[PDB]
A paper describes a structure:
The most significant distinction lies in the absence of a critical hydrogen bond interaction contributed by an arginine residue. In E. coli [name], an arginine exists in the corresponding site of Pro169 in CpPstS, suggesting that CpPstS may have evolved a distinct hydrogen-bonding network for phosphate binding. It was observed that CpPstS has a significantly larger substrate-binding cavity compared to the structures of C. perfringens [name], M. tuberculosis [name]-1, E. coli [name], and other [name] from different bacteria. Structural comparison reveals that α-helix 9 (residues 229–236) near the substrate-binding cavity in CpPstS rotated approximately 20° relative to the corresponding α-helix in the C. perfringens [name], M. tuberculosis [name]-1, and E. coli [name] structures.
[name], a representative [name] bacterium, which encodes an ATP-binding cassette-type phosphate transporter, CpPstSCAB. The high-affinity Pst system was initially characterized in Escherichia coli, Streptomyces lividans, and Bacillus subtilis.
Residue numbers in the entry: 24 to 224, 228 to 327
Write the structure that this text describes.
Amino acid sequence: RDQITIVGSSTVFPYATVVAERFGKKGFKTPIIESTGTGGGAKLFCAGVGEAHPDITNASRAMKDKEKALCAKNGITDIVEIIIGNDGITLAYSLDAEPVNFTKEHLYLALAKHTVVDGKLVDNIYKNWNEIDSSLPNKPIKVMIPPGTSGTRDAWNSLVMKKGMTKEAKALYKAGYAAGNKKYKKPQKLYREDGLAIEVGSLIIQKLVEDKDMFGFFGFSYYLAAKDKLQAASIDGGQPSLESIQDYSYAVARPLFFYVKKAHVGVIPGLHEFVKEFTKTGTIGKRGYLADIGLVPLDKA
């Protein structure tokens, strides 16, 4: 094989694509890149050490212990982690609607599998944002959530669900878990399944345009490209921006990664050279060509 193979995060995908396109003009073939999702990419990367398996998986959250364990089992223990920059998960919606600010708790309450009612966990009873907080708009809850195995789902679970989770809910889940419910050990993973938090799967933008009350998830680069049609909800009083993502004042700032199968260096031509190209200051630094399309570079202060 003489072409580099890259799988993984859809958040990282547009960035790795630009690097690949430039790379293809420097005496190597243009790498092959698939947008498979962080978790789907990790599974593929970790399937085996042979050339039939991907050289690189992109990730919008760190590799998980379960994933490292699979890799190890299939003989991949030499993995290089590269942090390319940052993302801000953006909760976008149609420009035709009013600006809005949701706290992390607001978001948790709307999306959660359960509402605490009379000291008991029951299926989510919130149908309108204004029920959760009278300061929120009278607007039905309609959210398109990322895929279950996506890194964006994982990061939202960690940064929003876990943190927005109420003390009261936490205690009920902990007690249910202690009493034997294994699914309640990590309750931040649990979303309502009554159609108000529908799993997603270009057309997200279209669906948001079609229903101004609907909200959706976007990696920052995708939101920026769509600003002619979409705006961002404030989260904890803050909008996503280069500055707020870079200093992590933005509440859903997050790092972006890719992982390199070291064994394939020296087997697949250009693999190391591609990594060095991606890691150049002119690529991922301030004013680099990835910053020009929305990558928030690592703060170097």
